[PDB]
């Protein structure tokens, strides 16, 4: 349920907002995975 998935098709604005939040969370996780100090 993320905007990164092309197969995902939201039906309403609530699903769109939830997908936006999931995409932000996934991007944060990816950044912390690829972060090196």
């Amino acid at each position: 349920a993320s905007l990164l998935d092309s197969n995902f098709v939201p039906i309403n604005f609530t699903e769109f907002v939830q997908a936006i939040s999931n995409t932000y969370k996934q991007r944060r996780i990816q950044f912390y995975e690829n972060l090196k100090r």
Binding site: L3, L4, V9, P10, I11, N12, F13, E15, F16, V17, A19, I20, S21, T23, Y24, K25, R27, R28, I29, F31, Y32, L35, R37
Partner: protein, 313 residues
């Protein structure tokens, strides 16, 4: 929905171009935990045990045993929701402003919805980072005309009951005096048993340039940065120390541990910019759109943050 809401489709297509906030570098992966709400308050309960007396020896027969007590503390975190409005061109009107090299009205400063949304999101992310680092909301470089916020809404720089040191104006260029104040603050730090944790320091560019000088007659093969790293390692039980430069800070040094048990960021899942469904439409080609974002969610333990302010007066 995407076959009906062109603005939603454009936001979905353009969401990937927005860059990640710089505040993520200030916290460990385990220190950040998303919550689920938009505006209101949340309560966290921490339980701790204690020993009420010396233990009892189990010899022969006995029924009187010592007791272990318990206690709890509750912390309330206040959140807030804010919105911004921006004008743009109507989708059906884009074709009448498209050009060979660009789309939009240069003379009247009107943009397509995707570009306007991207720029507004970038600005809002910058403001969010400023609030997270400083705990205040303002659009003036002077820092005045701040928006009054709710109680229990603090940042790293304004968190109460934390160690604060002030370097005098006359010694603003004296790195030895600066390090004396830093050592005093490090001594006044109270990390309890969680002292064996990595530490993070945030400095302004001027302070960083002062640090990169050779360590003071004079010496070589060692820098003030290395001296600071050793000093912080003297208290973090030889743990890793990281240093970062933030243009938001001004003549200020921030030191705090990277342990979730001491400092935790629990922001709302809607903190980052989110488009609104309400789109004002008129007979003209100009439309308006709204972006929402949530602020709040920093929790820290008492006397675990060192704030060194160098008076530049």
């Amino acid at each position: 929905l995407f076959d009906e809401n062109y603005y939603a489709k454009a936001v979905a297509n353009i969401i990937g171009e927005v860059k990640d906030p710089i505040m993520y570098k200030w916290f460990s992966p385990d220190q950040i935990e998303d919550v689920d709400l938009q505006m209101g308050y949340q309560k966290t309960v921490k339980w701790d045990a204690f020993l009420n007396a010396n233990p009892t020896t189990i010899a022969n027969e006995v029924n009187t045993i010592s007791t272990i007590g318990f206690s709890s503390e509750v912390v309330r975190l206040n959140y807030l929701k804010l919105q911004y409005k921006f004008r743009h061109l109507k989708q059906t009107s884009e074709k009448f402003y498209t050009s060979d090299s660009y789309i939009g009205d240069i003379n009247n400063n009107l943009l397509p919805f995707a570009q306007a949304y991207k720029l507004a999101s970038s600005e809002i992310i910058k403001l969010i980072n400023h609030f997270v680092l400083t705990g205040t909301v303002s659009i003036q470089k002077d820092g005045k005309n701040q928006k009054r916020l709710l109680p229990n809404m603090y940042g790293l720089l304004n968190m109460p009951e934390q160690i604060k040191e002030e370097v005098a104006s006359g010694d603003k260029d004296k790195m030895d005096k600066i390090f004396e104040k830093i050592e005093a603050g490090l001594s006044k730090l109270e990390l309890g048993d969680e002292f064996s944790t990595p530490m993070m320091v945030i400095v302004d560019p001027a302070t960083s340039l002062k640090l990169v000088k050779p360590y003071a007659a004079a010496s070589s093969c060692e820098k003030w940065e290395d001296v600071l790293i050793q000093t912080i390692k003297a208290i973090n039980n030889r743990e890793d120390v990281y240093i970062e430069t933030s243009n938001l800070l001004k003549h200020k040094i921030l030191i705090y541990p990277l342990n979730s048990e001491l400092i935790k960021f629990k922001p709302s899942k809607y903190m980052l910019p989110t488009p609104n469904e309400q789109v004002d439409k008129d007979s003209t080609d100009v439309a308006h759109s709204y972006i929402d974002f949530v602020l709040g969610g920093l929790l820290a333990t008492r006397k675990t943050i060192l704030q060194v302010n160098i008076k530049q007066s």
